[PDB]
Amino acid sequence: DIIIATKNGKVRGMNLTVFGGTVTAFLGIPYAQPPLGRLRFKKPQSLTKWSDIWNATKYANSCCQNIDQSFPGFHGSEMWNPNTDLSEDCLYLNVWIPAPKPKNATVLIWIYGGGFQTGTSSLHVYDGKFLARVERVIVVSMNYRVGALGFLALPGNPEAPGNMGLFDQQLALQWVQKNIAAFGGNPKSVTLFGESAGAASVSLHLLSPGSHSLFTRAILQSGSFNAPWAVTSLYEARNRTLNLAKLTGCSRENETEIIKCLRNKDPQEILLNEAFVVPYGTPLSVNFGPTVDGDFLTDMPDILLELGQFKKTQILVGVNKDEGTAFLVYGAPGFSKDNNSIITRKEFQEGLKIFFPGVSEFGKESILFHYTDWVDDQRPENYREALGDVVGDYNFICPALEFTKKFSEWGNNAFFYYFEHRSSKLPWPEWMGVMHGYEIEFVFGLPLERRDNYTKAEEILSRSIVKRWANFAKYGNPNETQNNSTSWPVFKSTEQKYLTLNTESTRIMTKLRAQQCRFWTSFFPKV
Amino acid sequence: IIIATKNGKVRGMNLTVFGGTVTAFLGIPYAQPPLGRLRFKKPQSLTKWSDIWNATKYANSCCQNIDQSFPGFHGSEMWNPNTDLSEDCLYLNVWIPAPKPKNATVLIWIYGGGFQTGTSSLHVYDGKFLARVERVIVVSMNYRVGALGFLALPGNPEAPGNMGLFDQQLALQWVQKNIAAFGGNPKSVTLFGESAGAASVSLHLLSPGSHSLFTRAILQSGSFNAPWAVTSLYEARNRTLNLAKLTGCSRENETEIIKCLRNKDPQEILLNEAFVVPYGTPLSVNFGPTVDGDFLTDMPDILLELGQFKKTQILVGVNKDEGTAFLVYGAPGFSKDNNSIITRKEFQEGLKIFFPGVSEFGKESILFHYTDWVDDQRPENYREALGDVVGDYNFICPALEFTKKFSEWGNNAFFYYFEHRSSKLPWPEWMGVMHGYEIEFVFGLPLERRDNYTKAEEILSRSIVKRWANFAKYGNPNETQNNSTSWPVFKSTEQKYLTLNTESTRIMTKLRAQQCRFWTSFFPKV
Ligand SMILES: *[C@@H]1O[C@H](CO[C@@H]2O[C@@H](C)[C@@H](O)[C@@H](O)[C@@H]2O)[C@@H](O[C@@H]2O[C@H](CO)[C@@H](O)[C@H](O)[C@H]2NC(C)=O)[C@H](O)[C@H]1NC(C)=O
Ligand SMILES: *[C@@H]1O[C@H](CO[C@H]2O[C@@H](C)[C@@H](O)[C@@H](O)[C@@H]2O)[C@@H](O[C@@H]2O[C@H](CO)[C@@H](O)[C@H](O)[C@H]2NC(C)=O)[C@H](O)[C@H]1NC(C)=O
Ligand SMILES: *[C@@H]1O[C@H](CO[C@H]2O[C@@H](C)[C@@H](O)[C@@H](O)[C@@H]2O)[C@@H](O[C@@H]2O[C@H](CO)[C@@H](O)[C@H](O)[C@H]2NC(C)=O)[C@H](O)[C@H]1NC(C)=O
Ligand SMILES: *[C@@H]1O[C@H](CO[C@H]2O[C@@H](C)[C@@H](O)[C@@H](O)[C@@H]2O)[C@@H](O[C@@H]2O[C@H](CO)[C@@H](O)[C@H](O)[C@H]2NC(C)=O)[C@H](O)[C@H]1NC(C)=O
Ligand SMILES: *[C@@H]1O[C@H](CO[C@H]2O[C@@H](C)[C@@H](O)[C@@H](O)[C@@H]2O)[C@@H](O[C@@H]2O[C@H](CO)[C@@H](O)[C@H](O)[C@H]2NC(C)=O)[C@H](O)[C@H]1NC(C)=O
Ligand SMILES: *[C@@H]1O[C@H](CO)[C@@H](O[C@@H]2O[C@H](CO)[C@@H](O)[C@H](O)[C@H]2NC(C)=O)[C@H](O)[C@H]1NC(C)=O
Ligand SMILES: *[C@@H]1O[C@H](CO)[C@@H](O[C@H]2O[C@H](CO)[C@@H](O)[C@H](O)[C@H]2NC(C)=O)[C@H](O)[C@H]1NC(C)=O
Ligand SMILES: *[C@H]1O[C@H](CO)[C@@H](O[C@@H]2O[C@H](CO)[C@@H](O)[C@H](O)[C@H]2NC(C)=O)[C@H](O)[C@H]1NC(C)=O
Ligand SMILES: *[C@@H]1O[C@H](CO[C@@H]2O[C@@H](C)[C@@H](O)[C@@H](O)[C@@H]2O)[C@@H](O)[C@H](O)[C@H]1NC(C)=O
Ligand SMILES: *[C@@H]1O[C@H](CO)[C@@H](O)[C@H](O)[C@H]1NC(C)=O
Ligand SMILES: *[C@@H]1O[C@H](CO)[C@@H](O)[C@H](O)[C@H]1NC(C)=O
Ligand SMILES: *[C@@H]1O[C@H](CO)[C@@H](O)[C@H](O)[C@H]1NC(C)=O
Ligand SMILES: *[C@@H]1O[C@H](CO)[C@@H](O)[C@H](O)[C@H]1NC(C)=O
Ligand SMILES: *[C@H]1O[C@H](CO)[C@@H](O)[C@H](O)[C@H]1NC(C)=O
Ligand SMILES: *[C@H]1O[C@H](CO)[C@@H](O)[C@H](O)[C@H]1NC(C)=O
Ligand SMILES: [Cl-]
Ligand SMILES: [Cl-]
Ligand SMILES: [Cl-]
Ligand SMILES: [Cl-]
Ligand SMILES: [Cl-]
């Protein structure tokens, strides 16, 4: 029998067959009291011992969230939708241990993304069994409250203070500290990693002192807190909370009466009103997300970073080549996943209105000008690809580069990557390229399964990315081998060297899209 | 020796140039003196004189303000007039090879000076070397500048505008009716000029009255589509009424304003021209060409797009550092006597001086486009960016635009880019290859070996002198020497041009295209 004794009771696990070996899996371990009833909108309360044996034998419920039904039956959009039942009772975590049991393994802890409104740790592409089997690490993931139930903010009021989902994550990190040694893990070798809003979450754990003692190193894939979508200002969050009360019939005089009212609404009557709390919303609007709660985050994050008040440790950071294209099919005129999406100069200007609703006409013109210095003005696809780059540069690439730059200047080793490979099984059209979220299966080893119709070069790439990630976790260095391997050099603010990742040639390059990012760092804020 | 003009007889003189002889006629009158009741009117054709005119000395230069910013400094005073000033100034010069030629091509020079200054008798416009070395006839003329040449009340023949342009046209007319008596071919005539003279040349390409008076055109550092080249009818009227206010000539109708301005001492007109525009820059053109309904029937850019101009070959070019000259006449931190290192805040202050009507957003976009440094460390970055802003906007990018549009009508265009800094240049090294300092090479001054030029400068000057004369004679700026690079036509697709310098003359494409894309496709939207 597969049984491990946690400090909240015993828990029973499960054996998995992975590449002629065994991976012991505990799926759905609870880490907090279910945020039901009077605990709705509050920080996670710690758990009390249970008598029996908890059966960590299946994935648990995913936290309440709206679903993406833009393309029913499409694997491209539905692979991100939750694959378990939805419930407010969702604060569970999973653990993958290599077999035979290790004596002191390094732990990788995964924070999924989803714009702080969607996501779940039980998706097929976050399966930690391959990492555990191939690299001998313990892999941990946790479900955390998303949407208004996770990030509703009446700042200073304990009944709904903001950043609950971030505290959800942090309490899972407290569990790993208190419990992972019992499974074979080293609490002193813990690496957080995550993608998109999960990468923004990872970078926020670097700033928050409460998290500092709970992990060793960080990996940020396609996200960081200085992204334009990551953090809501103190009082914009409160004003979206009030608009939600009004939208549900919960506008009261004192705040505790608003929260008391919101607690009697059904989850689905809250979810159906979240989209409306912001007046003109981009396809990248974070309705309810992190805020300066004065508890998890004591100041706006850009200030803490500039003043050097953050955890001093090594970071691995990177972005994909076409981060932006995924968002053009969700509201830009002339874009479909089913045609080649060739657009015109005015269809471009209307695309910019969708993504920059508050920017002036002079500002929207300067953007268009910076992205229209064609190398071949005969190329029809010019405007289709220019708009994807604008969305990609402004929202993901340039902030991640600027975060790495600023972080590197305080004396800790940073590494930057450019993921350039398109999946051979990607369900989306060609014109979208190396999309947001499509390095994850390569990081989690899914191409190592040959039963899965992957190309041999993709297995070699995935095997290489898996080794580099797990080595960065163990040693603070993302090396593959000492010989027959490109040395991945440190990102330094002068040279700004990064490593590209693809099947043809992994190269050391410099100053990724500097001419583009110079626009967003040095001209766009002045507009 | 004496030659018979259709209006009288003129006596010349013999010049010994490089062992040979050049026959010069300096100071032939081509129009009645625009005095008293002819002030502000178009030039009137001249009456015959019975005796002999002695065209043996440079004539009076037209009334104009003098640059006295740097007293005793050759770099500025070499552009000041070197004959006495007077409204009696409509004379011209003629240089002829010796022995007398047969049917020689004529090069007619039109000087610049912002339509405010200039004379044909400057040392750097000496046509004796051009005649000796290439056996061409060289003609230059004086034309009225300032308000005395370009005061405009549109529709009124007492002050119609463009009077200085008609001065030039009447000199071109003189050449058609007299250059044969001298040995020249009236049907082989090439206009060339620099700056305001180049812009003037390009305006003769548009005006129908001038079409039959020349064959080809050379445009050095200037063209009519430059921001400084043409005053709109509105600002021309606002500047004419301001001048009357400043001289006590504010009247109720136009005819009386002109009667009053005709009785003002020339210095009282000259010394008020500076105050007619409130927000001026070092490139301000107080009184210049306008849409007069006569010399220009429409706005020049409209004429250009529509193809209503003289179709012929053109030779067009610019220098590398066109903008520097103007940075020492207003921009803060700049001086001819130090290295003029400036800061980002001082760069923002220079922009305000050259773009006084532009929003802070627009001035920000200029700044941003010119600060993508190749080397972030070099302290000369902002000094080089400002002179590049002034040069690109005012000279380089208009001249490229002109050549593209002109050539698209089936005309052979040739574009050059002058990169040589004169070893004798009196201005500091940071100003580089300044506006106006290719003229010595076009006119053959470095061919005088007793002059402190370098050997390479003599070689370079001979190449340009040859290419220029060949373009006039044949329509192709080829050089006869075997080792010379072949000069291709400028066309809209490939946009090929020829660099000029001592080292090696290359052939390049799309000159400064990245900078000029700002000035054509984004700046008119701020
Ligand atoms: C705070 O937010 C309010 C939002 O009021 C709105 O009402 C909600 C119920 C929801 O329907 C939102 O989409 C609405 O925008 C801002 O209010 C603005 O001014 C009036 C006031 O009600 C509103 O009708 C306008 O639509 C809002 N303006 C815009 C441009 O949408 C308010 O400005 C925000 N800030 C502050 C300080 O209160
Ligand atoms: C050593 O192994 C290489 C594989 O490794 C490459 O891996 C990249 C991540 C990067 O670090 C790079 O510097 C490094 O060279 C083998 O080379 C490959 O060889 C096969 C043929 O067997 C080719 O089909 C592959 O395209 C090629 N991959 C390349 C060049 O990236 C090779 O087995 C071995 N080479 C030597 C010299 O020992
Ligand atoms: C332009 O105006 C001049 C003069 O303007 C005169 O207008 C009058 C109303 C009056 O206020 C007077 O003080 C002012 O000077 C005209 O010349 C004038 O012609 C009239 C004959 O009709 C004479 O009686 C005036 O003495 C004479 N004035 C002068 C100064 O000579 C002129 O005719 C007029 N022309 C046009 C086209 O408007
Ligand atoms: C058209 O001309 C008017 C008249 O302006 C004055 O400017 C002085 C320097 C001087 O030449 C004087 O003789 C002349 O009267 C211009 O008007 C001025 O505009 C500025 C704003 O830029 C105001 O501050 C002034 O008060 C105003 N003056 C007057 C008398 O109204 C006007 O700007 C000009 N327009 C154009 C497009 O050139
Ligand atoms: C070519 O240069 C010589 C002298 O070379 C330079 O020497 C410098 C110290 C300075 O004097 C500078 O002016 C000069 O250019 C010129 O010869 C001298 O010119 C001055 C007047 O400018 C006469 O007074 C001298 O007698 C004369 N000869 C000397 C000093 O030996 C010469 O004029 C010049 N040529 C041209 C065309 O500029
Ligand atoms: C990757 O690089 C690290 C160095 O950053 C290597 O680390 C050492 O690893 C061994 C275990 O094999 C330890 O016993 C040492 O104490 C480590 N030293 C340091 C300074 O980190 C690691 O072995 C390398 N891995 C590969 C596959 O080359
Ligand atoms: C697991 O590895 C850690 C080291 O990461 C071991 O801890 C020791 O070394 C730490 C730093 O290198 C220090 O904290 C201590 O020296 C020590 N840790 C203690 C005393 O808690 C840890 O013992 C290992 N556990 C095993 C091998 O079972
Ligand atoms: C799960 O699989 C593991 C390994 O495949 C089983 O446990 C091991 O079984 C092997 C062979 O029977 C023994 O040599 C090891 O000593 C066992 N390890 C431990 C820790 O017991 C285990 O029986 C399987 N679980 C089941 C069948 O429930
Ligand atoms: C967990 O499941 C228990 C029964 O499952 C089984 O019995 C044990 C002894 C093992 O043999 C296991 O493989 C079987 O599947 C329940 O009795 C128990 O109540 C469950 N736990 C909870 C918390 O409900
Ligand atoms: C130069 O001088 C005389 C002067 O009459 C002129 O006619 C002739 O061209 C020249 N003399 C020669 C060439 O002997
Ligand atoms: C014409 O020029 C000659 C040349 O010296 C001179 O002798 C003669 O007096 C001049 N005639 C005039 C000025 O009438
Ligand atoms: C030269 O002059 C003659 C004189 O009649 C004229 O016919 C001819 O057209 C002119 N041009 C050339 C190129 O000969
Ligand atoms: C250059 O000289 C000018 C005028 O004397 C002065 O205003 C400027 O500050 C000086 N700059 C430098 C760098 O010497
Ligand atoms: C494809 O998407 C929609 C049609 O469903 C349309 O708006 C768009 O123009 C199409 N693209 C084409 C025809 O290129
Ligand atoms: C250039 O001059 C004319 C014009 O084409 C021509 O007769 C001559 O052969 C050309 N010479 C060279 C070297 O191109
Ligand atoms: Cl996602
Ligand atoms: Cl395509
Ligand atoms: Cl000049
Ligand atoms: Cl003007
Ligand atoms: Cl007078």
Author numbering:
A (entry chain A): 3 to 529
B (entry chain B): 4 to 529
Quote the study on this structure.
However, the piperidine groups of inhibitors 1 and 2 points towards the entrance of the aromatic active-site gorge, while for inhibitor 3, it fits into the choline-binding pocket and it is instead the methoxyethyl group that is oriented into the gorge. Compound 3A had its methoxyethyl group substituted with a triethylene glycol spacer, with 7-(diethylamino)coumarin at the distal end. This compound retained good BChE inhibitory activity, with an IC50 of 60 nM, but instead showed poor solubility in aqueous buffers. The naphthalene–sulphonamide derivatives 3A and 3B have similar binding modes, where the naphthalene moiety points towards the acyl-binding pocket. The low solubility of probe 3A might indeed lead to non-specific interactions with huBChE and limit is use, and it was therefore not included further. For 3A, cryo-protection was achieved with the mother-liquor complemented with 17% glycerol and 1 mM 3A.
Brain butyrylcholinesterase (BChE) is an attractive target for drugs designed for the treatment of Alzheimer’s disease (AD) in its advanced stages. In the case of BChE, the active site is buried at the bottom of a deep aromatic gorge, at the entrance of which there is a peripheral binding site (main contributors, Asp70, Ala277). The active site features a choline-binding pocket (main contributor, Trp82) and an acyl binding pocket (main contributors, Trp231, Leu286, Phe329, Phe398), which accommodate the choline and butyrate moieties, respectively, of the substrate butyrylcholine (or its analogue, butyryl thiocholine).
